[PDB]
Structures are given as C-alpha cells and as structure tokens.
Amino acid sequence: ATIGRISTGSKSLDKLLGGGIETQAITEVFGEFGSGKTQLAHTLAVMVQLPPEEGGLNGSVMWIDTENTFRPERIREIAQNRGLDPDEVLKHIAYARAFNSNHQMLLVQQAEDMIKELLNTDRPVKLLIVDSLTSHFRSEYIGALAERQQKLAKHLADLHRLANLYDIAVFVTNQVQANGGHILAHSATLRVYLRKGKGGKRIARLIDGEAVFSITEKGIED
Numbered sequence: 524a525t526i527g528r529i530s531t532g533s534k535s536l537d538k539l540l541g542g543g544i545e546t547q548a549i550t551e552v553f554g555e556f557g558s559g560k561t562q563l564a565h566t567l568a569v570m571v572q573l574p575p576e577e578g579g580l581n582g583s584v585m586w587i588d589t590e591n592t593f594r595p596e597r598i599r600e601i602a603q604n605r606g607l608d609p610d611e612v613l614k615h616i617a618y619a620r621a622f623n624s625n626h627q628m629l630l631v632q633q634a635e636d637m638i639k640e641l642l643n644t645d646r647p648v649k650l651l652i653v654d655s656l657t658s659h660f661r662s663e664y665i666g667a668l669a670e671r672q673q674k675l676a677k678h679l680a681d682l683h684r685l686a687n688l689y690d691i692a693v694f695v696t697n698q699v700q701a702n703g704g705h706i707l708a709h710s711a712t713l714r715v716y717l718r719k720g721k722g723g724k725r726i727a728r729l730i731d732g733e734a735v736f737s738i739t740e741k742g743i744e745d
C-alpha cells in the first residue's frame with residue numbers, strides 16, 4: 524500500500540510531519556503530564572474520518588486507553604467543529620480500557636480481529652491509538668527494568684506488525700518528565716517531543732524546526 528497521512532488538525536504540525544502522521548508507522552509522542560498528548564490523540568481520532576481532500580483517510584479508529592482519559596464528549600466537540608456528525612464519528616471509534624499491561628497486550632491481538640473484519644469495507648481501520656502505551660509497564664515493573672524492556676519490545680513489535688501489515692497509523696503516547704525516560708528508545712518509527720510554551724501554546728519537535736499550535740474546540744489548530 525502507499526503511505527497514507529492523517530492530518531493532525533494543525534497546519535504547523537502537519538508541515539513538521541510532512542503532511543501528517545503516516546500509515547505503516549508508529550508515531551510516538553512524548554512529554555510531561557499536561558503537554559497535550561491526549562488532546563492530539565482525540566483530534567487524530569476525528570481527523571482520520573475526513574476524506575483525503577481534508578486530510579483524513581475515511582478511516583475507522585481503534586483506541587486502547589490505559590488511564591481512563593478518553594472523553595467521548597471531547598470527540599463530539601472536535602467532530603462538531605470539524606464539520607462531521609459526532610454520532611457517526613463516535614460509532615467509528617472502537618474503544619477498550621486496558622486493565623494492566625498483560626491485558627493491554629491481549630487487546631492488541633484482539634484489535635487484529637476487528638482490523639481484518641473492516642479491511643475490505645469503506646471504513647477500514649486506519650488509526651490505532653494506545654494512550655498511554657507505557658503507564659502500566661512502568662508501574663508494574665518497578666525495580667525490574669530488564670523484564671519491562673522485554674515485554675515492551677514484544678508489545679511494540681506487535682504494533683509494528685499491525686501498522687505495516689494492515690496499512691494503519693499507530694499513534695502512541697508516553698509520559699516522560701523529571702529524571703524519567705528511556706522514551707521508547709529507537710522503537711517508534713517517529714518520535715515527537717511535545718511541550719507547553721508561553722500562553723498555553725504547545726510546541727512540537729522531531730527527535731532523531733518546531734511546530735506551534737493551540738488546543739481549541741477544533742482539537743488542535745495553528
């Protein structure tokens with residue numbers, strides 16, 4: 524398949540990304556608590572449902588939530604201010620809460636079943652969100668870094684296999700603050716560092732210029 528792109532909702536961020544996040548890729552956004560990673564996830568879950576002329580892929584979404592941070596009412600607001608019907612947008616987001624890291628890993632295998640079901644339809648899965656990818660692994664493997672890296676490596680390999688095999692954009696969030704971080708090392712296809720700037724602006728930089736945007740009723744925008 525050709526590489527598809529999903530607009531982030533921000534012209535600035537899209538330019539930094541060469542058009543948007545890519546299918547057949549894992550995009551990892553990392554930054555401190557409150558930097559806007561989950562807002563970017565919510566916005567992408569709407570943007571992907573637009574036609575290509577508007578930066579989407581007419582796609583369905585699967586969302587794995589590890590922190591109970593998915594907000595349907597926020598999806599509705601973004602959809603309504605992106606010219607879409609909010610009920611339709613929500614009906615094309617499959618949502619699951621991961622209870623722990625082992626359940627999170629099983630959910631990725633379950634996602635493949637729905638990906639296959641929708642593959643030949645007019646609304647194939649085009650976006651798989653894992654928010655937060657690392658939170659359960661970090662809390663469960665305190666004092667056991669070697670084992671944590673083994674399990675994370677398999678989880679990321681599963682996510683890669685889905686991105687490439689089914690032409691999906693995988694978007695993952697990772698909280699990294701004071702003294703923290705192996706990030707995801709070199710595992711993602713693309714690492715985006717997100718931070719707060721003056722006056723509520725958010726600033727994005729590729730790790731391995733900078734885009735600037737705001738969080739608004741449209742999700743994010745310049």
Ligand SMILES: Oc1cc2ccccc2cc1O
Binds near residue numbers: 587619630631633
């Ligand atoms: O209905 C489902 C929703 C999911 C969401 C994310 C990951 C896996 C899922 C599996 C489902 O059957």
